[PDB]
Design a protein around this ligand. Structure first.
Ligand code: PRO
Ligand code: PRO
Length: 581
């Protein structure tokens, strides 16, 4: 189209248009305040509108990378706030856009948000619009790769929370669960996009194509390899656009593809029609989290075409990727009960087998027992799952998190305490999310969550790396990632660097803090505990813990509280090191 900025503006409409641009500024300039971004955003909103009314106008044919970038440039505090990011502005497109993206901070250390029901309802009634885009600021800046069309849907679900709720009699009781459920779903969607972008970047497009193949085949097991491949081809393009910070394109192509899929409903899945009349964003979200359709009844056994045919090697040498793309679709549309990562890992084994049989005298011999060999690859990861859930059953989440602290602290004690804690506290939650569903959802569940939390870890680590073992697992095949991390053992090499003089001691804030912060506080002790003596007994650990709990209990029940903590504090530091040797 002859003016892009305005091509897009009619394409999306003033609201989602302004959404998207604010998301783009807030992911560029994570540290600039929200009124700053509110301005940069109406200037390009005005200018856009101009290119709607006089398309030949001065500057309308420009690209968005020059248009956006042109405004990052009139943010005078780029040195102060982002260092050499202001050097970015000096450069020409496409380098200035190359450079701005570098400065994306995956771990921005801004204040966690404590939702206060009366302040938020007051903010909401006072300014609906500013409230909405405030939610877009907050999430987007803490989550610089958040899926932009998806963000806009959640801002919409968010404000509609403050719509149902601020009204009601007990405001808090109405708000607080709903915004907490929504907060979990948001974080989840944030990790999954973050997984996509780090796949595109550390591992090549194709690698991501496999994921969308097996996952999309599981959802629409009644559609073509052709058809599937077609969507996966537009999906990949959307997803690429976002991660590159081309949000407008992104949402627009996600719009088209959703049209497209809703157009081909029966060819794909009975389920689509539910989704197919909701407006663009509720439509796009519904389709993406859409239910697994059921496999058609009379499909032939995988064994014919991949294990008994005698043209299996020939096929496999003429068109490897195709044959293995087709195996992946074929295997996938058939086992909705398997973790996407597991399938790929099955795909890979199948491959390495053919790579070995197809060179024998009798390949058909060597390879006709493949699917059996593959049925057993699933049962060991199942082993871990179930063991990890029992552990969670007998201990409950907080207990289970503390076991994961212990384990993983030992694996990688050079990793930072915040990271071991966040990572360990989320591995705890998977216990809650998954352990209870019927197994036909369980394994996908657990492995879904695993992949997102490991990829979280990997993204923090590559920012400031401190474990070779860690960098390895992060940096080989995604498909081997949980394996590698599950196989890690204590760094028999790590020194108990003392972390001494700097000591970890409590104060009376723990009395007042919401239950999770107390946990974080305690867990950070657990970690630093282990960092200082990596060999320490399970029971050793367990008694030391039983004491902090005694210690805070006594001290949160005293009338003067910090006074207690300043008094009996030292004696826990003595009590503990002798416990330790
Ligand atoms: O929220 C809205 O709908 C207004 C109109 C477009 C930009 N903001
Ligand atoms: O997209 C992929 O290929 C990786 C491997 C399994 C999990 N996801």
């Amino acid at each position: 189209h002859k003016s892009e900025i305005a091509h897009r503006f009619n394409d999306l409409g003033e609201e989602n248009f302004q959404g998207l641009v604010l998301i783009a500024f807030s992911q560029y300039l994570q540290q600039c305040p929200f009124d700053e971004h509110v301005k940069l955003v109406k200037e390009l909103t005005e200018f856009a509108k101009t290119c709607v009314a006089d398309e030949s106008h001065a500057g309308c044919d420009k690209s968005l990378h020059t248009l956006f970038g042109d405004e990052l440039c009139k943010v005078a505090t780029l040195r102060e706030t982002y260092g050499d990011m202001a050097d970015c502005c000096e450069k020409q497109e496409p380098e200035r856009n190359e450079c701005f993206l570098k400065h994306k901070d995956d771990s921005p250390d801004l204040p966690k948000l404590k939702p206060e029901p009366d302040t938020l309802c007051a903010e909401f009634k006072a300014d609906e619009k500013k409230f909405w885009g405030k939610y877009l600021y907050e999430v987007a800046r803490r989550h610089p790769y958040f899926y932009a069309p998806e963000l806009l849907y959640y801002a919409n679900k968010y404000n509609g929370v403050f719509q149902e709720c601020c009204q009601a009699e007990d405001k808090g009781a109405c708000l607080l669960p709903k915004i907490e459920t929504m907060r979990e779903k948001v974080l989840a969607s944030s990790a999954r996009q973050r997984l996509r972008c780090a796949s595109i970047q550390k591992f090549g497009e194709r690698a991501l194509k496999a994921w969308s193949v097996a996952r999309l085949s599981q959802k629409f097991p009644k559609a073509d390899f052709t058809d599937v491949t077609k969507i996966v081809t537009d999906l990949t393009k959307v997803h690429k656009e976002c991660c590159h910070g081309d949000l407008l394109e992104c949402a627009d192509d996600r719009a088209d593809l959703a049209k497209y899929i809703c157009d081909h409903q029966d060819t794909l899945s009975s389920k689509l029609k539910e989704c197919c009349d909701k407006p663009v964003l509720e439509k796009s979200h519904c389709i993406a989290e859409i239910d697994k359709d059921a496999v058609p009844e009379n499909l032939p056994p995988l064994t014919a075409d991949f294990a008994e045919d005698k043209e299996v090697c020939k096929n496999y040498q003429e068109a490897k990727d195709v044959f293995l793309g087709s195996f992946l679709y074929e295997y996938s549309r058939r086992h909705p009960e398997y973790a996407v990562s597991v399938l790929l890992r099955l795909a890979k084994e199948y491959e390495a087998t053919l790579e070995d049989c197809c060179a024998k005298e009798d390949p058909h011999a060597c390879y006709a027992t493949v699917f059996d060999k593959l049925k057993h690859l699933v049962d060991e990861p199942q082993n871990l799952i179930k063991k990890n859930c029992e552990l969670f059953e007998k201990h409950g989440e907080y207990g289970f998190q503390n076991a994961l602290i212990v384990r993983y602290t030992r694996k990688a004690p050079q990793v930072s305490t915040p990271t071991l804690v966040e990572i360990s506290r989320s591995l705890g939650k998977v216990g809650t999310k998954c352990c209870a569903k019927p197994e036909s959802e369980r394994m996908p569940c657990t492995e879904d969550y695993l992949s997102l939390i490991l990829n979280r870890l990997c993204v923090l680590h590559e920012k400031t790396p401190v474990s070779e073992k860690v960098t390895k697992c992060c940096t080989e095949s995604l498909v081997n990632r949980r394996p590698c991390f599950s196989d890690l053992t204590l760094d028999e090499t790590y020194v108990p660097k003392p972390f001494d003089g700097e000591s970890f001691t409590f104060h009376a804030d723990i009395c007042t803090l919401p239950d999770t912060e107390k946990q974080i506080k305690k867990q950070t002790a657990l970690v630093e505990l282990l960092k200082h003596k990596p060999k320490a007994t399970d029971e050793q650990l367990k008694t030391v813990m039983e004491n902090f709990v005694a210690f805070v209990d006594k001290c949160c029940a005293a009338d003067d509280k910090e006074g207690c903590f300043l008094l009996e504090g030292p004696k826990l530091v003595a009590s503990t090191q002798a416990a330790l040797a």
